[PDB]
Curated annotation (Swiss-Prot), chain A:
Subunit structure comment from the entry: Component of the lid subcomplex of the 19S proteasome regulatory particle complex (also named PA700 complex). The 26S proteasome consists of a 20S proteasome core and two 19S regulatory subunits.
The organism of origin for this protein: Saccharomyces cerevisiae (strain ATCC 204508 / S288c) (Baker's yeast)
Job description of the protein: Component of the lid subcomplex of the 26S proteasome, a multiprotein complex involved in the ATP-dependent degradation of ubiquitinated proteins. In the complex, RPN6 is required for proteasome assembly.
Family: Belongs to the proteasome subunit S9 family.
Presence of the UniProt keyword Nuclease in the record: no
Note: Present with 16800 molecules/cell in log phase SD medium.
Domain PCI: 18-187
Taxonomic placement: Eukaryota, Fungi, Dikarya, Ascomycota, Saccharomycotina
GO annotation, cellular component aspect: proteasome complex; proteasome regulatory particle, lid subcomplex; proteasome storage granule
Molecular functions (GO terms): structural molecule activity
Location of this fragment in the whole protein: 218 to 434 of 434
GO BP annotations listed: proteasome assembly; proteasome-mediated ubiquitin-dependent protein catabolic process; ubiquitin-dependent protein catabolic process
Protein name: 26S proteasome regulatory subunit RPN6
Record has NADP as a keyword: no
Keywords per UniProt: Acetylation, Proteasome
Swiss-Prot record, chain B:
Gene behind the chain: RPN5
Keywords, alphabetical: Acetylation, Proteasome
Official protein name in the record: 26S proteasome regulatory subunit RPN5
Start and end residues of each PCI domain: 1-113
Portion of the full sequence shown: 295 to 440 of 445
Family: Belongs to the proteasome subunit p55 family.
One GO CC term, this protein: proteasome regulatory particle, lid subcomplex
From Swiss-Prot, chain C:
Descriptive protein name: 26S proteasome regulatory subunit RPN7
Function: Component of the 19S cap proteasome complex which acts as a regulatory subunit of the 26S proteasome, involved in the ATP-dependent degradation of ubiquitinated proteins.
Miscellaneous: Present with 51900 molecules/cell in log phase SD medium.
Name of the gene encoding the protein in the UniProt record: RPN7
Protein's organism: Saccharomyces cerevisiae (strain ATCC 204508 / S288c) (Baker's yeast)
Domain of life: Eukaryota
Organism phylogeny: Eukaryota, Fungi, Dikarya, Ascomycota, Saccharomycotina
Occurrences of domain PCI (ranges): 1-173
Intracellular or extracellular location(s): Nucleus
Residues shown, of full length: 223 to 424 of 429
Subunit structure comment from the entry: The 26S proteasome is composed of a core protease, known as the 20S proteasome, capped at one or both ends by the 19S regulatory complex (RC). The RC is composed of at least 18 different subunits in two subcomplexes, the base and the lid, which form the portions proximal and distal to the 20S proteolytic core, respectively. Component of the lid subcomplex of the 19S RC.
From Swiss-Prot, chain D:
Organism whose genome encodes this protein: Saccharomyces cerevisiae (strain ATCC 204508 / S288c) (Baker's yeast)
GO cellular component labels: cytosol; mitochondrion; nucleus; proteasome complex; proteasome regulatory particle, lid subcomplex; proteasome storage granule
Notes concerning its domains: The JAMM motif is required for the deubiquitination and degradation of ubiquitinated substrates.
Post-translational modification: N-acetylated by NAT3.
Similarity remark: Belongs to the peptidase M67A family.
Annotated gene: RPN11
Protein name: Ubiquitin carboxyl-terminal hydrolase RPN11
Length: 217, 146, 202, 96
């Protein structure tokens, strides 16, 4: 019961509830008899490490670890993965994660929940680093972003196109010089918007007037 | 002895590292628990950062626009160093800036809307009319004098 | 006009009661068509990709399948795979339908307009080859399709054939909001005149 | 004459323009408020055309008159903004 809820609130993206539920199921699975609860202690444990990585508190990934149940009783490739990704999100190094999931690929393929949260994780990580670079910069080359961010030149240009569409900086990428302009400018004014409504009102009113004048004709 | 070092950073003048280094080299680099001790030998190296970060305050206020190529002379840095130190310093909130990567111009500025610029322009006008009224009173007054 | 259609039919996914009214897989297909037409990214993604109702119904038949894959590709900016899905949508969805046989021509033409216009919003400059390659067409063929769509305008672009770029003009600022108002006002002035001459005659 | 007079810059207070933040405020409020009294104006004239004038005005919100009130606001904000344009055009050219 707790397991199911654990996965589902984790997916809904609340990692405070997930961690509590997956702590509860850790107590049950670990200490009662094993028939498949070997496999299910091991899996709940990996999702406990994952939840902390999303919060960006990575000391708690390390507090959970110890060779008493985490590198002793359940010892998997998956344990090494989680601390690798943990270091990488904290560092702000998307390159470290990219190396990490390459060599922990077999953990990744086998679990659905990890795979969903390592996508969530990739895009949240990419946006936070990307910001840092383009906040004190304008007219900045795409090659220059790429070195810092850990990505190919193209991969950067492709991603940048999507950030504009979400409107998280709403700029334009100029591809013929490779420069990125960030525009935070208001292109909107209050008077003008309210004026479109005011005029709108009068058009409806003039139809209503026309009926009353029908008698004259 | 103390007064000459502290005085430099209470003013908002320009200053340059190879010069500041030399001045205090047989005064305070020869006093331990300041610069030139052991752990303090590795803080003489820190003094460099302080001079730069103070200079950027001055330069932002004073230059509304300056070339980068000029900026790297001033701070006594090369291009790689100079961009890093402006970027960190924009985040901290002391200055607000935009830096261009091809090697064009680095503009230091604070945002100013249409409404804001005009407000200043309202105040100028009001103040000019107060100036003229008091001037008419002292002319009348001169007729009494002579 | 589909503006009304979307509104009624996205709701008709949730609760449907059917007495001489056509199948629930049939109603789902129609709803995806009307979603695309009306709404833009942010809204679209909620309504017709994240519906619980469509996600429980899956795809098993051709018609539903092609329409569905097209919709995710408009959102997800895979423009490569967009045109094979677009072409599938012409044959299997628009034309065998009674209520879209006459709106098939209009719907595909619009679709070509939107996808290229989305790309343009994220760009100030592109190159001709990059742009063409993504679509999976030729530069020559691309200039030709742009050259029907631009006069009427939803793209908001020009093409410099000479420097080899595609350049993008932006009239969105206060300029845009001024143009919106003067035109709406031009009509109010026409109507006021028109009724007024008639009573002044009486 | 002694009572009628005022300051030495009261006869020299039309050159004293206002801060334009405040003038923007004046622009913004008047347009917004008129949308809501206009809405009120639409409801009033949907009916109100059977017999007995006072009754109809009691029924369809013809008392608490929005027709009168919409005109009033418009005129009021209209006379202000003619002088504000006048002020700016004088001060820019005159001084410099």
């Amino acid at each position: 019961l707790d397991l199911m809820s654990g996965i589902l609130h984790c997916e809904d993206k609340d990692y405070k509830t997930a961690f509590s539920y997956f702590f509860e199921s850790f107590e049950s699975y670990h200490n009662l008899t094993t028939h498949n609860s070997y496999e299910k202690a091991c899996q709940v444990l990996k999702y406990m490490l994952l939840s902390k990585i999303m919060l960006n508190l990575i000391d708690d990934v390390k507090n959970i670890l110890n060779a008493k149940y985490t590198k002793e009783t359940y010892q998997s490739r998956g344990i090494d993965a989680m601390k690798a990704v943990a270091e990488a999100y904290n560092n702000r190094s998307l390159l470290d994660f990219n190396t990490a999931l390459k060599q922990y690929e077999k953990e990744l393929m086998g679990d659905e929940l990890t795979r969903s949260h390592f996508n969530a994780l990739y895009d949240t990580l990419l946006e936070s680093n990307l910001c840092k670079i383009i906040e004190p910069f304008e007219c900045v080359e795409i090659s220059h972003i790429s070195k810092i961010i850990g990505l190919d030149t193209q991969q950067v240009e492709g991603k940048l196109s999507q950030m504009i569409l979400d409107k998280i900086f709403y700029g334009v990428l100029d591809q013929g010089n490779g420069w990125l302009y960030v525009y935070e400018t208001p292109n909107q004014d209050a008077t003008y918007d309210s004026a479109l409504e005011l005029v709108g009102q009068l058009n409806k009113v003039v139809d209503q007037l026309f009926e009353k004048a029908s008698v004259l004709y | 002895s103390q007064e000459s070092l502290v005085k430099l950073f209470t003013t908002n003048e320009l200053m340059r590292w190879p010069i500041v280094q030399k001045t205090y080299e047989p005064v305070l680099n020869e006093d331990d628990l300041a610069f030139g001790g052991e752990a303090n030998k590795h803080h003489w190296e820190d003094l460099q950062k302080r001079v730069i970060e103070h200079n950027l305050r001055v330069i932002s206020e004073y230059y509304s626009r300056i070339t980068l190529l000029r900026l790297n002379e001033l701070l006594d840095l090369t291009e790689s160093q100079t961009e890093t130190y402006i970027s960190d310093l924009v985040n901290q909130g002391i200055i607000y800036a935009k830096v261009n990567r091809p090697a064009k111009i680095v503009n230091f500025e604070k945002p100013k809307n249409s409404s804001q610029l005009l407000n200043e322009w309202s105040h100028n006008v009001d103040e000019l009319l107060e100036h003229i009224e008091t001037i008419g009173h002292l002319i009348t007054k001169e007729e009494i004098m002579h | 006009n589909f503006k009304e259609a979307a509104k009624l039919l996205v709701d008709s996914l949730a609760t449907f009661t059917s007495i001489e009214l056509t199948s629930y897989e049939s109603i789902a297909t129609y709803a995806s068509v009307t979603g695309l037409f009306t709404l833009e990214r942010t809204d679209l993604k909620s309504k017709v990709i994240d519906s619980p109702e469509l996600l429980s119904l899956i795809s098993t038949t051709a018609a539903l399948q092609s329409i569905s894959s097209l919709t995710i590709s408009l959102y997800a900016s895979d423009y490569a795979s967009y045109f094979p899905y677009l072409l599938e949508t012409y044959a299997n969805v628009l034309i065998p339908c009674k209520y879209l046989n006459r709106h098939a021509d209009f719907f595909v033409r619009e679709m070509r307009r939107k996808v290229y216009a989305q790309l343009l919003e994220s760009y100030k400059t592109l190159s001709l080859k990059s742009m063409a390659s993504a679509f999976g067409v030729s530069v020559a063929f691309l200039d030709n399709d742009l050259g029907k769509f631009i006069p009427n305008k939803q793209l908001n672009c020009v093409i410099d054939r000479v420097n080899g770029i595609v350049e993008t003009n932006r009239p969105d600022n206060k300029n845009a909001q001024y143009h919106l108002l003067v035109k709406q006002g031009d009509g109010l002035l026409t109507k006021l005149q028109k009724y007024g001459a008639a009573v002044r005659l009486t | 004459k002694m009572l009628m007079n005022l300051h030495k810059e009261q006869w020299q207070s039309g050159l004293k323009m206002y801060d334009y933040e405040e003038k923007e405020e004046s622009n913004l409020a008047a347009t917004k408020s008129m949308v809501k009294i206009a809405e009120q104006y639409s409801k009033r004239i949907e009916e109100e055309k059977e017999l007995t004038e006072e009754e109809l005005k009691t029924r369809y919100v013809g008392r608490q008159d929005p027709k009168k009130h919409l005109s009033e606001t418009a005129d009021e904000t209209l006379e202000n903004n003619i002088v504000s344009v006048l002020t700016a055009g004088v001060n820019s050219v005159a001084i410099k």
